[PDB]
Design a protein around this ligand. Structure first.
Ligand SMILES: *[C@@H]1O[C@H](CO)[C@@H](O[C@@H]2O[C@H](CO)[C@@H](O)[C@H](O)[C@H]2NC(C)=O)[C@H](O)[C@H]1NC(C)=O
Ligand SMILES: *[C@@H]1O[C@H](CO)[C@@H](O)[C@H](O)[C@H]1NC(C)=O
Ligand SMILES: *[C@@H]1O[C@H](CO)[C@@H](O)[C@H](O)[C@H]1NC(C)=O
Lengths: 112, 49
């Protein structure tokens, strides 16, 4: 049900805002100078663009010198309440040359 | 005048950062909000090539 993120300043993308989406066949990435969702969803002008409980998915995002850097890891789990007590390290996914003044962010959920 | 430069005002621009308009940079204390007089309008020019 959890599927993506928006990063930027206004998040409406009237000025450049990053968007990252998983659609169960691909990951899709956009920065588009066009109006984004006002109350964000997935149904159950793009200066940069790219295309590729029992589970825990971990991510790190950082934004340095116009690059946006992503790390991740996937693991089994046996606790819903708190994060696991053990140690593990995330590994790099992608490193994106986007050049954007990110200060605020929001996750995306699928809706009926 | 098809060649342009956008900024000179105050809060400066980071290495490989990019900027595109939505609300007016004005040089002082005035709520200019579309006005183009003293301190007002974008710090945005065109070259006389
Ligand atoms: C990058 O974006 C931030 C906000 O997302 C801008 O920071 C504001 O700048 C004004 C002056 O221009 C300050 O009065 C505010 O206090 C700042 N707000 C925050 C939350 O820091 C910043 O100016 C932007 N820089 C560029 C060059 O786009
Ligand atoms: C996922 O995104 C790609 C690229 O936008 C698109 O071709 C594909 O049809 C999408 N998959 C689904 C299930 O909609
Ligand atoms: C498309 O982006 C440009 C800036 O690259 C902007 O001037 C233009 O108004 C945008 N179009 C829309 C419909 O927002």
């Amino acid at each position: 049900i959890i599927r993506g993120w928006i990063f930027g300043t206004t998040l409406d993308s009237k000025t450049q805002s990053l968007l990252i989406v998983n659609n169960a066949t691909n990951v899709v990435i956009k920065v588009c100078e066009f109006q984004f969702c006002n109350d964000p969803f997935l149904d159950v002008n793009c200066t940069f663009e790219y295309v590729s409980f029992k589970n825990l998915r971990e991510f790190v995002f950082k934004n340095i010198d116009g690059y946006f850097k992503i790390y991740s890891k996937h693991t089994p789990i046996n606790l819903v309440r708190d994060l696991p007590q053990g140690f593990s390290a995330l590994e790099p996914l992608v490193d994106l040359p986007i050049g954007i003044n990110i200060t605020r962010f929001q996750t995306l959920l699928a809706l009926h | 005048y098809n060649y342009r430069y956008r900024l000179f005002r105050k809060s400066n621009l980071k290495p490989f950062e990019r900027d595109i308009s939505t609300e007016i940079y004005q040089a002082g204390s005035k709520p200019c909000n579309g006005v183009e007089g003293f301190n007002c309008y974008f710090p945005l020019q065109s070259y006389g090539f």
